């Protein structure tokens, strides 16, 4: 109607008090007087509520409660009183009034409320339809990381959501702005349709939509999947010492599935490299591994991801690499190189910024489009060479334009004029440069530049004007008229025998999975990740130490070649594995040669660095490097470090902050002045003694004679006396 609202206004305007306020205070100022109150923010609400719940009438409620529920219930309880709450016309009320309403009050219609409260009810849907696996007990590494905590965040900014919320619940009171995106329009029309005729406070609708649409993040310690639906159930899926395997109801998003398919394949390849039969190990792991409780082999059979490790896995399974795509009408097929991707933004000549996905690395494409074809050689924003042929010069030139845009050169971006706007499906920004240059290329060719070439029969150049020139041509342009195999060591080659993908080339970069990976493999430790490798490896040495100690004494080469050390080797840089093994194996044999000096902790520390065919170099090392989550960490040879820390107070070895087990108490009371197994061909005797001259660095130890003593900066601010022993070691 709008009749009884203007009526009450006039009645209020009768009052000189209210008409004073309604005329003097502006709209701006109404936000101030709205929050004008004598009531403080309660300092100790827990106390006050316990104090107040002992009272008869501790709840305040709208005075109209006196018309809606009786003054006394069937048992005689007073439900409401006439006392006005301080600062309003609400009345003080008993908790029995709340209970009466809930058992005898007016019923309303609320069946659509789950649509208003979707953000809550989606949590119950994921849980109701979730699946539980077993609980595994193991030291649980948790990386503090910013993650989503709002599953289903139809991703928008805050202002964009404000426009949406206004359109849905306050349509007549919208500001000047309009709905800008197709995201904002489809959400608005869906929300308008879903929330149609739902008797509920518009304030609550506005609130829930605010919580639902905007992305919200938090720093949280996380082990395993980082996806929002897994973040949502951290309390249920991980503790200090346990993982509860769980899969939320619903389907994984392709982004997530692609991101952890890459991680899983890289880890499978990295593992296979160091095994005796990589191709057999890779196949074993592919068949046993699952992502989000889906088998990896069927993921690969239907996933188009184009990445080196994934392609090695697809090759080993005999399934076709996603080698090709189509762009601008022509089909591109990569024949050499790989697509390392980088999402960045660049300026044009118009000074307009664009969020591109620029590609890196030397690539080589066979390109064809029914009327023209070309061999393309490309670098990062570089057209190295394009050899183009076709039935017609027009057709050749159109492919040339497409290649000059596919190159992403700075030359061609600087040569753009005006703004880029095309379509009501709006095409992505690579086509925005194409459709622009397809309808005009006058500055592109003038700015592209020209190079002189040797006259070769069958080859001709093309000038900016369009003429054919034998010895001049646009930069990089020449005009002229797959079955894969994989070997034991995972090298991928073409029919011709040329190297397409190498496992050594696989990206070393790691990163935390978005969905759970389960290898279900004997070649893989229980848990995903490199920290788990370290902990499990030193745990395994402590558990079976007695067996391994005598195996150290009797048959050492069998100990070094244990396959339980292979995962540890993936953490060592390829180039260092051999020399680290030589340094380690030598240091052990010194401990065997030099009788008396025996350090069980030193053995356990360095034992995993044995597992690689050793090189015969004589270099020195104060630490071994380990790649952990992208960062190099240094395990010191002498004493404790972050990677390895023997704490005598607990009698525990601490690996990256995690207890890995207690050694035998024999090893607490175990010592000797001399330390073998620290320096190659030297011995540590004890404290520094100036009688033997000034202090030296480790790189300057070559100058000492066979038997002479010296002072050395050995590590961690310590200075030490050192003798060069006379006979060496096996």
């Amino acid at each position: 109607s709008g009749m009884e609202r203007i009526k009450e206004l006039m009645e209020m305007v009768k009052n000189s008090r209210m008409r004073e306020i309604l005329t003097t205070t502006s709209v701006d100022h109404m936000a101030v007087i709205k929050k004008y109150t004598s009531g403080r923010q309660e300092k100790n609400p827990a106390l006050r509520m316990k104090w107040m719940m002992a009272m008869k009438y501790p709840i305040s409620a709208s005075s109209r409660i006196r018309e809606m529920i009786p003054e006394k219930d069937e048992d005689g309880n007073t439900l409401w009183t006439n006392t006005k709450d301080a600062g309003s016309n609400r009345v003080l009320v008993s908790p029995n009034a709340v209970t009466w309403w809930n058992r005898a009050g007016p019923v309303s219609d609320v069946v659509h409320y789950p649509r208003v409260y979707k953000m809550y009810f989606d949590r119950l849907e994921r849980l109701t339809h979730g699946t539980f696996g077993p609980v595994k007990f193991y030291n649980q590494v948790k990386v503090r990381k910013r993650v989503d905590i709002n599953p289903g965040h139809k991703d928008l900014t805050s202002r964009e959501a404000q426009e949406v919320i206004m359109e849905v619940v306050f349509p007549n009171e919208v500001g000047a702005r309009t709905l800008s995106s197709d995201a904002q329009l489809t959400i608005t029309k869906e929300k308008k349709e879903e929330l149609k005729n739902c008797k509920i406070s518009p304030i609550m609708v506005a609130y829930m939509l605010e919580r639902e649409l905007v992305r919200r993040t938090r720093f949280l310690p996380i082990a395993g999947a980082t996806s929002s639906t897994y973040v949502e159930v951290l309390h249920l899926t991980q503790g200090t010492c346990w993982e509860q395997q769980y899969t939320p109801g619903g389907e994984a998003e392709n982004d997530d599935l692609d991101q952890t398919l890459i991680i899983a394949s890289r880890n499978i390849v990295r593992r296979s490299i160091v095994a005796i039969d990589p191709l057999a190990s890779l196949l074993s792991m592919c068949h046993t591994t699952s992502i989000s409780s889906e088998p990896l082999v069927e993921i690969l059979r239907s996933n188009p991801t184009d990445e080196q490790a994934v392609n090695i896995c697809k090759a080993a399974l005999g399934i076709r690499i996603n080698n090709s795509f189509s762009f601008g009408g022509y089909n591109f097929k990569r024949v050499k190189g790989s697509s390392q991707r980088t999402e960045k933004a660049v300026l044009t000549g118009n000074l307009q910024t664009l969020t591109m996905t620029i590609f890196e690395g030397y690539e080589e494409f066979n390109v064809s489009g029914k009327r023209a074809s070309a061999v393309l050689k490309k670098g990062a924003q570089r057209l190295i060479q394009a050899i183009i042929g076709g039935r017609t010069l027009e057709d050749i030139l159109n492919l040339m334009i497409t290649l000059m845009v596919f190159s992403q050169e700075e030359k061609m971006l600087k040569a753009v004029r005006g703004d880029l706007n095309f379509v009501n499906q709006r095409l992505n920004p690579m086509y925005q440069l194409l459709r622009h240059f397809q309808k005009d290329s006058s500055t592109l060719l003038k700015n592209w530049g020209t190079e002189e070439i040797d006259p070769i029969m069958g080859i001709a150049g093309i000038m900016p004007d369009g003429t054919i020139n034998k010895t001049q041509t646009l930069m990089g342009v020449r005009l002229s008229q797959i079955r894969v195999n994989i070997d034991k060591y995972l090298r991928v080659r073409n029919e011709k025998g040329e190297l397409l993908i190498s496992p050594e080339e696989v990206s070393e970069a790691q990163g935390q999975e978005k969905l759970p990976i389960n290898y279900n493999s004997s070649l893989m430790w229980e848990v995903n990740g490199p920290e788990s490798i370290l902990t499990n490896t030193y745990h395994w040495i402590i558990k079976n130490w007695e067996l391994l100690k005598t195996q150290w004494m009797t048959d050492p080469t069998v100990l070094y070649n244990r396959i339980e050390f292979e995962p540890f080797q993936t953490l060592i840089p390829k180039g260092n594995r051999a020399i680290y093994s030589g340094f380690t194996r030598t240091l052990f044999q010194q401990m065997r040669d030099v009788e008396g000096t025996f350090d069980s902790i030193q053995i356990i520390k360095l034992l995993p660095f044995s597992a690689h065919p050793p090189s015969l170099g004589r270099t020195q090392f104060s630490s071994f490097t380990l790649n952990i989550r992208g960062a190099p960490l240094r395990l010191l040879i002498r004493g404790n470090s972050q990677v390895f820390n023997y704490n005598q107070m607990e009698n525990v070895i601490i690996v990256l902050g995690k207890s890995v087990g207690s050694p035998e108490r024999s090893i607490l009371t175990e010592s000797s002045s001399i330390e073998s197994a620290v320096l190659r061909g030297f011995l540590i005797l004890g404290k520094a003694n100036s009688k033997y001259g000034p202090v030296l660095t480790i790189g300057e130890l070559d100058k000492l004679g066979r038997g002479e003593k010296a002072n050395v900066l050995i590590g961690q601010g310590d200075t030490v006396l050192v003798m060069k022993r006379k006979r060496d070691s096996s």
């Binding site: 106390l47 002992a54 007990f137 249920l236 503790g239 346990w242 207890s659």
Partner: protein, 514 residues
Amino acid sequence: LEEEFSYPPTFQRLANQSLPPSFKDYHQFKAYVSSFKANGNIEAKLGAMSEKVNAQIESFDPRTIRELELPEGKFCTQRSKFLLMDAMKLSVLNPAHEGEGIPMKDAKACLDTFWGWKKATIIKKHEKGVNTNYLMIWEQLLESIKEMEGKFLNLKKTNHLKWGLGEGQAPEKMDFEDCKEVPDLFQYKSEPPEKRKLASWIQSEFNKASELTNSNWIEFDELGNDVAPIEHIASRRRNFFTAEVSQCRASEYIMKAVYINTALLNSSCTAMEEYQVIPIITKCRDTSGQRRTNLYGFIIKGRSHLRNDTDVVNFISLEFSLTDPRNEIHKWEKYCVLEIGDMEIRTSISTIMKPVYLYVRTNGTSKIKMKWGMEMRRCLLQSLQQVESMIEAESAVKEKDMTEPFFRNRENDWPIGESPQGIEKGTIGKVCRVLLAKSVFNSIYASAQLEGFSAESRKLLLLIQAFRDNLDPGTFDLKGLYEAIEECIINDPWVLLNASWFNSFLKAVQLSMG
């Protein structure tokens, strides 16, 4: 399109006076800052500054350092709101649940199990009190219980009861003009608390709080069904926790605290002008399964016009006991102990005749203290998650649920006390009950002294740990740290015992090392 903001003259003159000393004008100082460029300013002044301004690292060896100094004075008295180890129960067998039935009806039922009451006599005076008021209060209460007909009991404001509850003791408030010239008008006493000496009883109390009992003192509300495997694991472990904690003596104290403070707060709020009787009740389940209602005594609430959260309710606590107060008279400074009856007690194969005492005292509490007493069940959480983290830490290394081994085997044990033989070790269940007692006693004996001692002594503990970790700890003013600790050891029985515990720990560490 512009934007402006300038100082009017008044503020401009304030701007000129809020500069470093060498500047005469705000415009001047703003120019000095806009054009400043560093040219060894810090190094210059660092060369100019006295080398007495330094932080010398004095290396820290816990073999070097001394034990904390505990104060001297009269002995520390009991100060709990209710008896602990000295309590005695009259009880009835009762299927009622953990909070059912009319309190005073339950109370009278418990009284009616005991005959052999006596004419009451004073056997240990409250030296600072009018002890015949305590005697008359007990007799008044006993006859008012006899004659009550209702759910609640409000005593008449007699002279002896008015005294015991501090009726009228507030000085009357006047304007300063009307009393300006009174000679002895002074500011309220604001000295630091009088010091007190550590006494035997608080260590004894803690030993008894750490023990097992024959009754389940805490009933737990229901959970949703287990579904996740980890929830089944949790409930298995929760079974061990529940029995270990429910049967611990400290849990009885929890439930006494929760009941008393809940009843006092509610009566304080609803019966502000009434001297309301509150019986001291607990319900429990024997290990035999029998449910039981216990009566420890009574509490008489004074007036309770509590406004500020620190405002005081005066109350009188009348509590049964078989403990002879004369054997440890310094423990009972605040009490007036009566002898009120004789009890025939069973043993193995003989009946013993013991006298029944009534520990009587005036006492007080506040809304904030009652609130925290009502919440004393969270002490359960402090102990148990420390225990569970210990079980979980091994489970990670052992890669199996070590719950059942820890509670059923005794291969794992921790130091938790000292006998003449030396350091005694205990099982995970004992550790659980010791840490529960500790947390319960922090709640019973909360104090600024405990807050200060705990936070400052934590630093000294960490320094000791750093040394034992071989991390080469260093202090700057170790003497000042000892003063920050010892400043907090004034008079509280619980803080004194914790200070002693630290020394015992320091001494035990020194031995095992050098």
